[PDB]
Amino acid sequence: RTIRYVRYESELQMPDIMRLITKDLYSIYTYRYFIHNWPQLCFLAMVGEECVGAIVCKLDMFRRGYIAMLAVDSKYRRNGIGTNLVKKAIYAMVEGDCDEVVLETEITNKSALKLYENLGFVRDKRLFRYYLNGVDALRLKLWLR
Amino acid sequence: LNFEQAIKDGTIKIKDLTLPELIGIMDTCFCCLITWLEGHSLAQTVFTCLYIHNPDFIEDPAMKAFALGILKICDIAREKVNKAAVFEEEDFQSMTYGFKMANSVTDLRVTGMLKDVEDDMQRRVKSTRSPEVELEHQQCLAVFSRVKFTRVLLTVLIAFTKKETSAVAEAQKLMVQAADLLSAIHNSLHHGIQAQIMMGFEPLVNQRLLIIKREEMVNYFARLIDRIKTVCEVVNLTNLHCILDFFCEFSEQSPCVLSRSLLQTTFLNKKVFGTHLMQDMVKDALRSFVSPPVLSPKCYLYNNHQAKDCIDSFVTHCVRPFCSLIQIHGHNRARQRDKLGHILEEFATLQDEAEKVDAALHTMLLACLGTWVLYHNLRIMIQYLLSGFELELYSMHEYYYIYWYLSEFLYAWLMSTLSRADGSQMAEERPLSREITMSQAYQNMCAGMFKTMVAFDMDGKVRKPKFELDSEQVRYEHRFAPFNSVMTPPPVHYLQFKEMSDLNKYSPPPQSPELYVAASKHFQQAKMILENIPDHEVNRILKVAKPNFVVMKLLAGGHKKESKVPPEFDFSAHKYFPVVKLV
């Protein structure tokens, strides 16, 4: 069971991308726009002839990066795919002259919070009822300079 | 279906209404009102009541009066919340979506209609005061209780809108009545028509123009009445420091937006309580805190017309930062941290102006106004730092330097400020002795926690983030970024922090048992201070300190030394200081 990490350069994988998003947690035009403007930041984790995980990020002007989506298949979690996927996106952001990488998450997602804390991310703000479900959210940012 | 299009259809009843129908309708409308007050919209919660859309169509006096009361309560609440402006983007939705919200009828008329409906129902209750008769009597009691509660709540909301704050003192007694009434509305809760999309409600009324269970309604309303009664007592204060402490204590409970807005509007755009001027309140706070020579009636500086026109300018310059500080306290506990961080620039400007004014006054014949401004600024910074603990914004490995900043640097400055203020008070001659004692307990708690975290990191019991581009330096700079806008006290950078926090000065360098014993001695001093002075906060601090001392004394003896599991930090006992358990 060999896993692979591949950037975004094709037009076949967006249908695979959405399948890995709606089954984990938005409109199709959100992903379309994010892939459009920043194709150099969207990464996928493919094992065999399918896609196991995905990350979609945007970097916009201090030049601040943003991590929009990070999802892994249920049968393939806890293998370190997410940590490597986030590392190979932070590195691409760094090669793009970014100053801070910000993101938002649910306070209930303890696994994601522990993962990002291990990666070095530090909580900066807490938002009340920020998510449409009703749960409070946490804003985690990593400063590079 | 729309109310106007359904009155002709016959799906809703506007007259000859049964008592259980009214009980259920009033309970559902109360739940909708409470849900709206919790931060949701109006077209989704309150306006789902078809009756409230046009109460002129209701022929039954009771239902129409209840609809008018609900609409007027919504009007007053929206007006007060908009005036106060202490609600975030998503903590309240004040848009009315173009609804005629009972502006045609006066509020006193609504109160009179409610009183008439209550009297013409107490008469019915007395007519049967002694099975079908018992059920009718119970339903009448339920209806009367709901009507009376609506009337008294609307009366309190009205009395809170009077120009004079003294009217609030005419409403507090009414709250006591609610204590003997809400339980009644709770007791006869099974009489109303249960939902199944209940009768008289269409939740999908608003789809082209764009709840809580009944059991939780009574407790929520009781808590809200308690909050309003707590708010009402703020009119008895006379010094800005006491009002600041009151605002902080009120916000510590995380009150609802209505309560915070009511407190904000009752406190103050230019006159406090409608009686005192904020300039005079600032001067009184200065006189009671530092007692500068200019403010002393017989110190020859009051008679000077140019020192007066130098102190008054400073007072007028300080009036807006304080209003902003109170407003920041009025917000919820999330944006409070950022607003505290941002008020630092304004307070630094105020500190510079105070220093210049004090220097000029001394030259014309030190550090009185500067001391007062420094005290307030230190309070702001300490509260800002502890708020991150309140919001779980700090990671495990960030505890040691946050606690070191709080204890070794910020609280030392606070003690110097307080001691100098008391000395100047004595020189011009114990309202700060309690504050000094509380700060002593807080500083000892923070110092013990800091030593604990340092020893834990030395022992390897704290998990650090290992990844190539994450450095402590940038984290430390960004965590304490708001402190760059202040000048006195100077910001402590990473290099100075590592220099002072290093353990290589002491020969030999301390090991884990020594730091554990030091933390135990700090916790013991905190306990010996607190348990000799009491209110709830002292009890919470003592309950967070007493087990901590015995835990650290046990752990200093070599227990669980070889283990590497990260200890748990329970913040249930106290907001800011955790109880470090080993299990």
From Swiss-Prot, chain A:
GO cellular component: cytoplasm; cytosol; NatC complex; nucleus
Sequence positions bearing N6-acetyllysine: 23
Domain of life: Eukaryota
Keyword Lipid metabolism: no
GO BP terms: protein stabilization
Molecular function per GO: protein N-terminal-methionine acetyltransferase activity; protein-N-terminal amino-acid acetyltransferase activity
Keywords from the UniProt entry: Acetylation, Acyltransferase, Cytoplasm, Nucleus, Phosphoprotein, Transferase
Start and end residues of each N-acetyltransferase domain: 4-145
UniProt keyword annotation of RNA-binding present: no
Subcellular localization: Cytoplasm; Nucleus
Entry's family note: Belongs to the acetyltransferase family. MAK3 subfamily.
Subunit and partners: Component of the N-terminal acetyltransferase C (NatC) complex, which is composed of NAA35, NAA38 and NAA30.
Role: Catalytic subunit of the N-terminal acetyltransferase C (NatC) complex. Catalyzes acetylation of the N-terminal methionine residues of peptides beginning with Met-Leu-Ala and Met-Leu-Gly. N-terminal acetylation protects proteins from ubiquitination and degradation by the N-end rule pathway. Necessary for the lysosomal localization and function of ARL8B sugeesting that ARL8B is a NatC substrate.
Protein name per Swiss-Prot or TrEMBL: N-alpha-acetyltransferase 30
Organism: Homo sapiens (Human)
Residues of the full protein shown: 211 to 362 of 362
Curated annotation (Swiss-Prot), chain B:
Pfam families in alphabetical order: Mak10 (PF04112)
Phosphoserine PTM sites in chain numbering: 104
Assembly and oligomerization: Component of the N-terminal acetyltransferase C (NatC) complex, which is composed of NAA35, NAA38 and NAA30.
Main location group: cytoplasm
Subcellular location, record wording: Cytoplasm
Protein name as annotated: N-alpha-acetyltransferase 35, NatC auxiliary subunit
Function summary: Auxillary component of the N-terminal acetyltransferase C (NatC) complex which catalyzes acetylation of N-terminal methionine residues. N-terminal acetylation protects proteins from ubiquitination and degradation by the N-end rule pathway. Involved in regulation of apoptosis and proliferation of smooth muscle cells.
Family from the record: Belongs to the MAK10 family.
Any Gene Ontology CC annotation: cytosol
